[PDB]
Amino acid sequence: REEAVVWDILDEVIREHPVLLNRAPTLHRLGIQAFEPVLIEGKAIQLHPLV
Amino acid sequence: KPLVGTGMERAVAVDSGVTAVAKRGGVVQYVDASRIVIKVNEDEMYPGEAGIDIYNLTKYTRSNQNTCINQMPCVSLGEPVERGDVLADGPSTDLGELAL
Amino acid sequence: PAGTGYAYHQDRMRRRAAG
Amino acid sequence: QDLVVTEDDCGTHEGIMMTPVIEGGDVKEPLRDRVLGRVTAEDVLKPGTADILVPRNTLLHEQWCDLLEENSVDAVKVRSVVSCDTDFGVCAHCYGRDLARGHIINKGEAIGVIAAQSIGEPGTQLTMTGGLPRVADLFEARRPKEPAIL
Amino acid sequence: EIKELLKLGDLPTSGQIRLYDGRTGEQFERPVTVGYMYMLKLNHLVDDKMHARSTGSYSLVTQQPLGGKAQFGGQRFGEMEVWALEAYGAAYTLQEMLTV
Amino acid sequence: TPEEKLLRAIFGEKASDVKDSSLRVPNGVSGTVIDVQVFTRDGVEKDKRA
Amino acid sequence: GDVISDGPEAPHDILRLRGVHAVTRYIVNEVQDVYRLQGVKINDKHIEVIVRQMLRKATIVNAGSSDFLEGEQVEYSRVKIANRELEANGKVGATYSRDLL
Amino acid sequence: TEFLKPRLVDIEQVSSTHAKVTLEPLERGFGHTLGNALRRILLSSMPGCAVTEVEIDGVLHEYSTKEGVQEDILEILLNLKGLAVRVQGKDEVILTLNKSGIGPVTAADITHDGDVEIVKPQHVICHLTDENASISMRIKVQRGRGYVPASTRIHSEEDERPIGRLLVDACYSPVERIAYNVEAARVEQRTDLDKLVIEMETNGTIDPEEAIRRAATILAEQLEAFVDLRDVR
Amino acid sequence: TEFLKPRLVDIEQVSSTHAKVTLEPLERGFGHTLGNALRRILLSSMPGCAVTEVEIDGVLHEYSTKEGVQEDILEILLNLKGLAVRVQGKDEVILTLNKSGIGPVTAADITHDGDVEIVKPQHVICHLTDENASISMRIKVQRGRGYVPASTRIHLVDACYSPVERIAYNVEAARVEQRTDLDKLVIEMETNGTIDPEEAIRRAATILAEQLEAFVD
Amino acid sequence: QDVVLGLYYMTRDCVNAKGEGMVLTGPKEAERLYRSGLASLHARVKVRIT
Ligand SMILES: [Zn+2]
């Protein structure tokens, strides 16, 4: 139902919980790196420029 | 429309069937978002049957890529058009040019 | 049998050839 | 692959002699880059002696490499994974410190993979003697067409 | 001709002007190039590309994530990706990846 | 099963002999219905809408 | 190990005639020549570990417990000749020759 | 020692669309400090009344064609988003457009209301191609702030069934282009003071003086919290 | 029509001089218009009393040397700009500093005056060398709004009036429970201590509203 | 890329620009000079640093 109340609960379950990000030609081990999730409106993945 | 261009865009629009090109020249009798009826000039008209060339426009419909292919009339009521003139734009065509 | 598992395999590998 | 850091110190004095590359002109690569983060095979002397600069096996970090550079030190023997006495693996001392962290390599890190991955990844930039196929000939041990005899 | 057409435009030859940040309202050092570029939207549209799956259907022959509802089978995890985990010390991440 | 059977008893719903196969809008795609077509096998009675 | 003619040399020789450290120095410097020519920084370490894996196997010379001509892991042999230097019979032995694969 | 407050001087109308207001008594640098901060609030959060819901005659959805009109329904909806109007004491009004006969249907063919002011009676809604072709439409106009696209206007649902009620995208805003230029104004005695020439552009639905006041209104109301800081939660 | 006024605002101070306030939720784009317009008035038009004119005991030009001090004439001036002062009922007061003898000359070694308040008696003015060494000068402190550099004097030091030492505003996206994007506002300031950060931003925003007095109803 | 062009353009110096020759107590009032429009990003200046 996507009740509005779930969004605050998701910020709880998200907080300390890394996600793994990967690109297509994984070559060296940095081809996979763990990140902390930040909730974003929209369908695009935002990726720290330095990486 | 492309503001900066080459000059092929006219050729691409017409040669592709996306636009609707006049079969014979004449004056537009009726203009609707649905159809277009051209009353032919006598030189282009066959002696028999008299006639008018009626262009039935394609309306909103599904493309292969799930895009929308819809034709729009580019001419106004009672306007002179000569054979080989752009009658209606297709998707991504403007006044006979190719606007992608 | 490496990284985090290296502690494990080590602990198991030694259990073998024993009693 | 299956190559992993297993023991701590195989305890071999053995190692390879590290000098700058000096290819025909001037210093195509310094000594400091070649030896950085590796571990000494034996203590190194100054140009004079009765002087222990680096005491036996010591990780050469930035200060140690600069103290060697302060002095005129021209040559250094270094423990390598090729010389490691540990069987079925690499002793942590013979490898080196390198990681995403500067500290000496941990016990149990799978170095073969990170070694192979590190060599393979830059390979996009090589040419088509010379180039990338030339590298493969080296690793394939392939005998050249008209070799010399020793 | 381009520069000449810009003269008739009343617009600078440089094709660059001074621009001001809409936030601080202060100027921008150096002139910046502003103009009109024809721009296309390719259909790689993000709400096509975007997919996510928690627990979906499974292939029968091999019990493996498979999309049947269009809630798509999971992302395909490869050999090279396994090595990336193998270079890292992540044993548990790897076990859970190909087991649970 | 037993506890489902108790469930139907308490809330008194008659569990149908028919299962729901209805075509439903995929999650997240949203639009306006511009057309509907009904193709039918020859010999089956066309329903009202068709 | 001197140059008795000119032209390139097989790394098999360098290992055999010149020794282990010589050939490993040869590989790393030649392969590193290729990368550094492109501006690629790869620590010599990684190349050394690949090399260690190339020569993992060896061929026996002497005898007393193993197969004389057998190509086999120098890991096994080295742990085994330690098992004879003070264990069972000295036997003999055995001397091997590192191989380049 | 202490300070100086500004005031608006001559608000020079040029077109119903565009005009130049001016603010004379500005201290050093306050012309820039204001002009951008005002441009900020000017372009964005200004109230406007834009058409929202449109229910027409024979049309189920925006993707159809009315027999007798050369404009596709989608294109006519788009024409409405650009219809500039102004109401006064009503926050939403529904306008009835009726016309028939061959010719253009402008924005003056609608039915006038007490609060209805059509600022562009010549604005083209659509053409009409056949002698006895007739179009009747219910046009629901509301007032608001910002940009509300038609998509975000479908979550309340709760039976908005009327299949013929075509929502359009809400553009609510009068402002089109805002530019400010500060030239140095010397009142005869003061060292250096500056002027503010704020050159704006409008859809003709708001007069300059009304706008710039309610603009400045929001400012102190936002600064209200800003002054003292009670660490409120 | 009606508008949004924020809530939840935490000022976590790191010392009395420096602080990071944060204020959410701000509607679209309002984070910059405020953050910049206030940065503008803090750094630019704020009132402060900073040293301006310095008349020295034995030396007329900036290219000379004072006997007995290892500090260059230019460098002591810089020390003066960081001497923080406040007046009370006076719009300008000129203080005479006298001290001598081997050692550092601090700000408590100055002459205290009735309306004079030195916020940092510990402020290092300069050192002194050996033997005797003598120094006293009448130093003219003025009042104004802003940073008035020595350059703008044509008929000296640069006037640093504003108490502000550094202002930064950062606009981050604030999510109200069912809205898309609102912005947050982090204003990190640093002060010379003659005004506390929280007070300033009030009178800072205050001066702002004082200018609006002809438009608001 | 974008970042290093920022820092390169940031720490760089031209020969004559606003604020040339002056002196400042510390970086805090240096930004105060720049942000207010008094000093140019690149001008030669002595400032007290710790
Ligand atoms: Zn070792």
Closest approach of J1 to chain I, Cα-based (Å)? 23
- Report d(CA G54, CA G73) in Å as an integer: 11
Task: Check: CB of residue E86 under 8 Å from CB of residue E80.
Answer: no
Classify residue J21 as left (phi > 0), alpha (psi -120 to 50) or beta.
left
Strand J23-24 relative to strand J46-47, pairing: parallel
Closest CA to H216 of H49, H6, H76: H6
Binning chain G into helix, strand and coil, the percentages to the nearest 5 are: 50, 10, 40
Which of E21, E24, E26 has the highest number of chain I CBs within 10 A, making it the mutation to test binding with I? E24
H71 Cα distance to chain centroid: 25
Q: Do domains H1-47+173-233 and H48-172 have the same CATH topology?
A: no
Closest CA to I84 of I105, I103, I104, I107: I107
Q: Residue G78 C-alpha to ligand 1 middle, in angstroms? A: 14
Classify residue A17 as left (phi > 0), alpha (psi -120 to 50) or beta.
beta
CB contact under 8 A, D110 and C7: no
Q: Does E87 touch chain D (CB under 8 A)?
A: yes
Structure tokens at H129: 């191609």
**Whole-angstrom distance between the N-terminal and C-terminal Cα of chain B?**
8
CATH number of I1-47+162-217: 3.30.1360.10
Strand I94-100 relative to strand I134-145, pairing: antiparallel
CB-closest option in D80, D95, D116 to G50: D116
Please report which helix (H) or strand (E) contains residue J29, including its range.
Answer: helix J27-35
Strand H126-128 relative to strand I47-54, pairing: unpaired
- Chains in contact with A, where contact means 3 or more Cβ–Cβ distances below 8 Å, are D, E, I
Distances from the Cα of F19 to the Cα of F16, F22, I106, angstroms:
8, 9, 91
Q: What was the structure determination method?
A: X-ray
* D84 appears as a binding residue in the annotation: yes
CB-closest option in B30, B33, B77 to H65: B33
Domain I48-161: homologous superfamily in CATH: DNA-directed RNA polymerase, insert domain (2.170.120.12)
- Report d(CA D120, CA I168) in Å as an integer: 45
Collect all residues with Cβ–Cβ distance below 8 Å to E86 and sequence separation of at least 6. Answer: C2, C3, D1, D110, D113, E94
What CA dihedral angle connects D129, D134, D139 and D145, to 10 degrees?
-50
- Report d(CA B60, CA G21) in Å as an integer: 76
Task: Check: CB of residue H225 under 8 Å from CB of residue I9.
Answer: yes
- Chain D residue numbers with beta carbons less than 8 Å from the beta carbon of C7 are 108
Q: Residue D87 C-alpha to ligand 1 middle, in angstroms? A: 9
Sign of CA dihedral D67, D69, D73, D76: positive
H77 Cα distance to chain centroid: 17
Entry field: residues in chain C: 19
User: What CATH architecture applies to the domain H48-172?
Assistant: Beta Complex (2.170)
Long-range contacts of J2-11 (CB under 8 A, 24+ apart): J2/A49, J3/A49, J9/J41, J10/J41
* D10 appears as a binding residue in the annotation: yes
Residue E88, Cβ neighbours under 10 Å: how many? 23
Structure tokens at I64: 């000379």
Half-sphere exposure (Cβ direction) of B84: Cα atoms closer than 13 Å: 3
Collect all residues with Cβ–Cβ distance below 8 Å to I32 and sequence separation of at least 6. Answer: E23, E24, H40, I169, I171, I183
Tell me which DSSP letter residue G16 carries: I
Helix/strand/coil for A32: strand
Structure tokens at A2: 């996507």
Looking at the DSSP bridge assignments, the partners of residue H138 are: H55, H96
CB-closest option in D122, D135, D149 to G5: D149
- Report d(CA I175, CA I184) in Å as an integer: 9
Residue type, position H22, single letter: T
Closest CA to D6 of D71, D90, D62, D85: D90
- Chains in contact with H, where contact means 3 or more Cβ–Cβ distances below 8 Å, are B, E, F, I
CB contact under 8 A, I40 and H28: no
Distances from the Cα of B82 to the Cα of B47, F11, H213, angstroms:
19, 76, 58
Q: How many helices (H) and strands (E) does chain C have?
A: 1, 0
Residue I138 has phi, psi (to 5 degrees) of: -90, 110
The burial of D111, by beta-carbon neighbours within 10 Å (0-12 exposed, 13-18 middle, 19 or more buried), is given as buried
Tell me: cis bond preceding I25? Omega within 30 of 0 counts.
yes
Helix/strand/coil for A7: helix
CB contact under 8 A, I177 and A39: no
- Report d(CA I163, CA B2) in Å as an integer: 56
Collect all residues with Cβ–Cβ distance below 8 Å to I106 and sequence separation of at least 6. Answer: I121, I122, I123, I124, I125
Distances from the Cα of D33 to the Cα of D26, D44, D61, D121, E73, angstroms:
15, 17, 11, 21, 47
Declared resolution, Å: 3.4
Helix/strand/coil for G13: helix
CATH number of H1-47+173-233: 3.30.1360.10
Q: Which of residues 11-70 of E touch H (CB under 8 A)?
A: 20, 22-26
Q: Does G25 touch chain D (CB under 8 A)?
A: yes
Residue I101, Cβ neighbours under 10 Å: how many? 11
Tell me which DSSP letter residue I186 carries: E
Rg value, chain J, Cα: 11
Q: Residue D5 C-alpha to ligand 1 middle, in angstroms? A: 10
The full set of domain ranges for chain H reads: 1-47+173-233, 48-172
- Chain I residue numbers with beta carbons less than 8 Å from the beta carbon of J24 are 78
* D94 appears as a binding residue in the annotation: yes
Residue type, position H13, single letter: Q
- Report d(CA G31, CA I11) in Å as an integer: 59
Q: Residue D81 C-alpha to ligand 1 middle, in angstroms? A: 6
Helix/strand/coil for I140: strand
In total, the C-beta contacts within 8 angstroms joining chain C to chain E are 18
Binning chain E into helix, strand and coil, the percentages to the nearest 5 are: 30, 10, 65
Structure tokens at H168: 């359009």
